[PDB]
């Protein structure tokens, strides 16, 4: 591989340079129109996510099917952690797009969405309370990509994961934290991935029910990623 020979700073730069762009939503919210905007936005972000995954160091060294497996398992977690990251500077609000900033009251016009909104908002404030930095954020999102499906070539994925752990510790030591604060913060960040996994599972069920609603037109790509969870 190539990711194992990179330094911690080169790993950070590789992840920052790979970041996907911020997309805009299509410019009186009904359940159909609200779900339409959110699923239209999520579908367009999935295209940029796939090309972002290619640029995550170590991801190209995997077979095509292993790449498919990891993305099929983690795509909703990756969308969610990205949403909560750009919502950090907007307390009590979710920044789906620069022109689409929503609160939990607006999440009420779609049945069942409030619970997911509250969980997303809880994650964003947790990131805000911890003062999560962008260099730490890109490490966590990469960890989700490689870890979420790894329990379902595996030695290489675990070696890249260890490399990202080294990079995370490198950032915290560079920020002036003691050895104790380093492993405490590492643990605090990784435990949030358990909640993010929880939110994703709740989000899959919500999207599956809206599929059988026939409420919202879901793109074929979004339907295929949803069908990966049987």
């Amino acid at each position: 591989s190539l990711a194992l020979s990179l330094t911690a700073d080169q790993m950070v730069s590789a992840l920052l340079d790979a970041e996907p762009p911020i997309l805009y939503s299509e410019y009186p919210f009904s359940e159909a129109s609200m779900m339409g905007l959110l699923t239209n936005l999520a579908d367009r972000e999935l295209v940029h996510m796939i090309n972002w995954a290619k640029r995550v160091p170590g991801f190209v060294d995997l077979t095509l099917h292993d790449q498919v497996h990891l993305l099929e398992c983690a795509w909703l977690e990756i969308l969610m952690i990205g949403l909560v990251w750009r919502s950090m500077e907007h307390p009590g609000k979710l920044l789906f797009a620069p022109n689409l900033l929503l609160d939990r009251n607006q999440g009420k016009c779609v049945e069942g969405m409030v619970e997911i909104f509250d969980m997303l908002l809880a994650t964003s404030s947790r990131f805000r309370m911890m003062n999560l930095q962008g260099e730490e954020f890109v490490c966590l999102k990469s960890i989700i990509l490689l870890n979420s499906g790894v329990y379902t070539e595996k030695d290489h994925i675990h070696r890249v994961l260890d490399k990202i752990t080294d990079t995370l510790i490198h950032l915290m030591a560079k920020a002036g934290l003691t050895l104790q604060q380093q492993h405490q913060r590492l643990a605090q960040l990784l435990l949030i991935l358990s909640h993010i996994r929880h939110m994703s599972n709740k989000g899959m069920e919500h999207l599956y029910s809206m599929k059988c609603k026939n409420v919202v037109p879901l793109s074929d790509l979004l339907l295929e990623m949803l069908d990966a969870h049987r």
Binding site: I50, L71, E72, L221
Partner: peptide
């Protein structure tokens, strides 16, 4: 035959 396949290859 999945959309994800061709998006990863291109």
């Amino acid at each position: 035959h999945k959309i994800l396949h061709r998006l990863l290859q291109d």
